[PDB]
């Protein structure tokens, strides 16, 4: 068993995305009502509000080193903001349906976004130009993520697949004499809502409308399903690897956050809320510190 040591809670209308700042004690929270909040979870206070979307904002992420954050909305825009000047700097337009996720790359000057329009887009945020459109999924792309150390992207789609994309050819598109799908991971019998890379091991987690969390393993030449976490009783909204313990975390519309053993895939702990479905979970890049977005706001907690 484990305990949840709550460090901060916001009370709001439904929250969709959360992003930890890497060095300041801040979270961004993007809300179903279109507002983005910036909270200090050390003081427990609201620092700023950012209103630049119409309708839900599902994507939200900080740049790792620049004073920027990116948001992605059901109004199809990918907005880039400066949190020091408190200005919306520009909109990146191109998606033709809801944006589900947006993140910054850790080294290249890139934003990743994915959309119900079935595409993944890569944008150069310095030049403000779309530099790639990754096509292949045949339904909403619910999640996309950069690999932390290799030129890979993993994506999850309501077409029931998880895709791994080789973007090495994209980085070298103009090298002297594009992205391509490397793996199509099939197994879920319903749409896939989320996917995640392990920070150091060649592992992938996915979670879906089949109420399952699946663990996959890859090499440079093959990828395969390893095992399944069973126990959620509604759609699984999100999943991640604990960066510092051999544990899997998932969050679900069944109103629970579940902790699972990475090696056995057995239940370790279940946390429940009485009235709130969970939509998203994230972990701080450094700290044993997690955030979860739900129907009534956001919780920031340690797991002990």
């Amino acid at each position: 068993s484990m305990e949840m040591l709550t460090k901060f809670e916001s009370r709001s209308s439904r929250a969709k995305g959360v992003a930890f700042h890497p060095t300041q004690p801040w979270i961004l929270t993007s809300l179903h009502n279109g507002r983005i909040q910036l909270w200090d979870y050390r003081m427990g206070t609201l620092l700023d509000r950012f209103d630049g979307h119409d309708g839900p904002v599902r994507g939200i992420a900080f740049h790792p080193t620049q004073p920027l954050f990116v948001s992605g909305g059901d109004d199809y825009k990918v907005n880039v903001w400066n949190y020091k000047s408190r200005k919306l700097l520009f909109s990146l337009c191109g998606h033709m349906d809801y944006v589900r996720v947006c993140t910054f790359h850790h080294e290249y000057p890139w934003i990743l976004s994915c959309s119900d329009d079935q595409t993944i887009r890569i944008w150069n945020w310095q030049s403000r130009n779309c530099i790639a459109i990754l096509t292949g999924h045949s339904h909403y792309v619910m999640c996309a993520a950069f690999h932390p150390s290799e030129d890979l992207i993993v994506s999850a789609s309501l077409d029931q697949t998880v895709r791994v994309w080789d973007i090495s050819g994209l980085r070298m598109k103009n090298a002297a004499p594009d992205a391509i799908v490397k793996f199509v991971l099939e197994g879920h019998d319903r749409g896939v809502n989320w996917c995640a890379f392990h920070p150091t091991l060649p592992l992938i987690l996915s979670a879906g409308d089949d109420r399952l969390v699946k663990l996959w393993r890859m090499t440079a030449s093959k990828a395969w399903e390893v095992d399944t976490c069973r126990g959620h009783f509604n759609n699984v909204s999100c999943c991640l690897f604990h960066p510092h313990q051999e544990l899997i975390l998932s969050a679900s519309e069944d109103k629970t956050i579940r902790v699972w053993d990475l090696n056995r895939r057995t239940a370790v702990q279940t946390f429940r809320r009485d009235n709130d479905r969970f939509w998203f979970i994230t972990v701080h890049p450094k700290l044993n510190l997690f955030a979860a977005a739900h129907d009534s706001g956001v919780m920031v907690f340690k797991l002990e």
Binding site: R14, H32, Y140, M142, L158, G191, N193, R277, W279
Partner: peptide, 4 residues
């Protein structure tokens, strides 16, 4: 629908 995943609208929520």
């Amino acid at each position: 629908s995943h609208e929520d």
